[PDB]
T-cell receptor, first 213, second 214 residues
Framework: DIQMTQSPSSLSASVGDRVTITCKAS??????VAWYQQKPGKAPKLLIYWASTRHTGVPSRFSGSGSGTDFTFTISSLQPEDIATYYC?????????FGQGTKLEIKRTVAAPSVFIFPPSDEQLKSGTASVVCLLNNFYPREAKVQWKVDNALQSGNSQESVTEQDSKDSTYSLSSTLTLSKADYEKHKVYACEVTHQGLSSPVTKSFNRGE | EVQLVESGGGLVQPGGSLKLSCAASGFTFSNYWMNWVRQASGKGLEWVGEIRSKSNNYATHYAESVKGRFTISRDDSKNTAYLQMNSLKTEDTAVYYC?????YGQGTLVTVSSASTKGPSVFPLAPSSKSTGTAALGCLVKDYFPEPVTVSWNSGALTSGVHTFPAVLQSSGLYSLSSVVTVPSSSLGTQTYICNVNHKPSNTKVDKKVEPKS
């Protein structure tokens, strides 16, 4: 079983940088190596095969080189839409093997989140559960602290976050936090707050509502 | 012009079986070697196997992890490749891709679980009464199994400012998912905002109008 170990695992780089990824084959695999881009939520795209042949329609800014054990994948000028995980594959012997992949993230300037709070719908309160949502939109970098308060009481263990992958144009993250309460617990309290700490805010931003106003 | 359409993915008992298909067009099918690759959630690409052309006696090769259990075959008259899966395990849970070595299909998800199918509830994330003007609204697709749900806005005509967050596995072993869109604040009286939620596994299709709350 021919190992393919990629270097590095993940990489941060600025728009326009020359990016370089290496893949080490544990045995000679001649030029029988391909390179793959997988953008978030998409199918793998073949970029390079026979170590250096560009697949049709693929942008010239992508190149491969190598022969034997050591292979290189280059992006000449990193574009915002090149956010993806990159894969090397060996196809000399069965079984064909992938590398563990290289996750390519973009460095950009700080962008403070826009923060929005959402009360639970009347429709959902009929079900006996209440979901309160905090949206942190279009921020960089990723590190963001969301705190839920209900009538001044910090809520811990009754929320779950989800972060999108870096946007293909502006290289920003978005984050949603959901606080799940029983209807009973929800109907007993008045003030619903999420407080957002982020590098691009001079101090923590709070969005809130009063149940019913 | 090259198309690869996977089908036959879904929920299945451990120990059970499932047959995947791959409808190919835009290339002389019989000359190409078809491959299956699969991807577990937040993990690497794994090669499954490859079937060669008729002139190679339809020779098949398999990854160590699936040999004995999986069977690749082709039908050159129907321009289709197949993956027959037997003695399925939870480890086999992944999106399964079909390749002619040059292109991949959009993929199809196989979930190997004893957990039951369950259709989501769709709840509005209603925009607030506020002047600043960018406004945010959305849909909460709550309490479904298995993955996936798809979300579009206004039948796919509204795509700019749209964030569809990854599903989170809740404590109950059911998935939840949010989709939000920022829009001009001055459109909130006049432009209709509808989120189209589909959960094919449970046969659930919802159009949820999200508007400002009275």
């Amino acid at each position: 079983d021919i190992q393919m170990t990629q270097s590095p695992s993940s990489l941060s780089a600025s728009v326009g940088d020359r990016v370089t990824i290496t893949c080490k084959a544990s045995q000679d695999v001649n030029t029988a190596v391909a390179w793959y881009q997988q953008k978030p939520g998409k199918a793998p795209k073949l970029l390079i095969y026979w170590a250096s042949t560009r697949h049709t329609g693929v942008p010239s800014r992508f190149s491969g080189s190598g022969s034997g054990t050591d292979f290189t994948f280059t992006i000449s000028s990193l574009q915002p839409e090149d956010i993806a995980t990159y894969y090397c594959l060996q196809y000399i012997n069965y079984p064909y093997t992938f590398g563990q992949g290289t996750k390519l993230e973009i460095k950009r300037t700080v962008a403070a989140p826009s923060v929005f709070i959402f009360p639970p719908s009347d429709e959902q309160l009929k079900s006996g559960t209440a979901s309160v949502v905090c949206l942190l939109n279009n921020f960089y970098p990723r590190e963001a602290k969301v705190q839920w308060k209900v009538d001044n009481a910090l809520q811990s263990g009754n929320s779950q976050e989800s972060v999108t992958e870096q946007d293909s144009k502006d290289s920003t993250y978005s984050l949603s936090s959901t606080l799940t309460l029983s209807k009973a617990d929800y109907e007993k309290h008045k003030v619903y707050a999420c407080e957002v700490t982020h590098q691009g805010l001079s101090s923590p931003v709070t969005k809130s509502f009063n149940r019913g106003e | 012009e090259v198309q690869l359409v996977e089908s036959g993915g879904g929920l299945v008992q451990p120990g059970g079986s499932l047959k995947l298909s791959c409808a190919a067009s835009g290339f002389t099918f019989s000359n190409y070697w078809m491959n299956w690759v699969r991807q577990a959630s937040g993990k690497g690409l794994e090669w499954v196997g490859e079937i060669r052309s008729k002139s190679n006696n339809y020779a098949t090769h398999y990854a160590e992890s699936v040999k004995g259990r999986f069977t690749i075959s082709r039908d050159d008259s129907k321009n289709t490749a197949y993956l027959q899966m037997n003695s399925l395990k939870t480890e086999d849970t992944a999106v399964y891709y079909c390749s002619n070595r040059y292109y991949y299909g959009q993929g199809t998800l196989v979930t190997v679980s004893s957990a039951s199918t369950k259709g989501p509830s769709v709840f509005p994330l209603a925009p607030s009464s506020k002047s600043t003007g960018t406004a945010a609204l959305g849909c909460l697709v709550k309490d479904y199994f298995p993955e996936p749900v798809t979300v579009s806005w206004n039948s796919g005509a509204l795509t700019s400012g749209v964030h569809t967050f990854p599903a989170v596995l809740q404590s109950s072993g059911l998935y939840s998912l949010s989709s939000v869109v920022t829009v001009p604040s001055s459109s909130l009286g006049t432009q209709t905002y509808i989120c189209n939620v589909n959960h094919k596994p449970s046969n659930t299709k919802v159009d949820k109008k999200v508007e400002p709350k009275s």
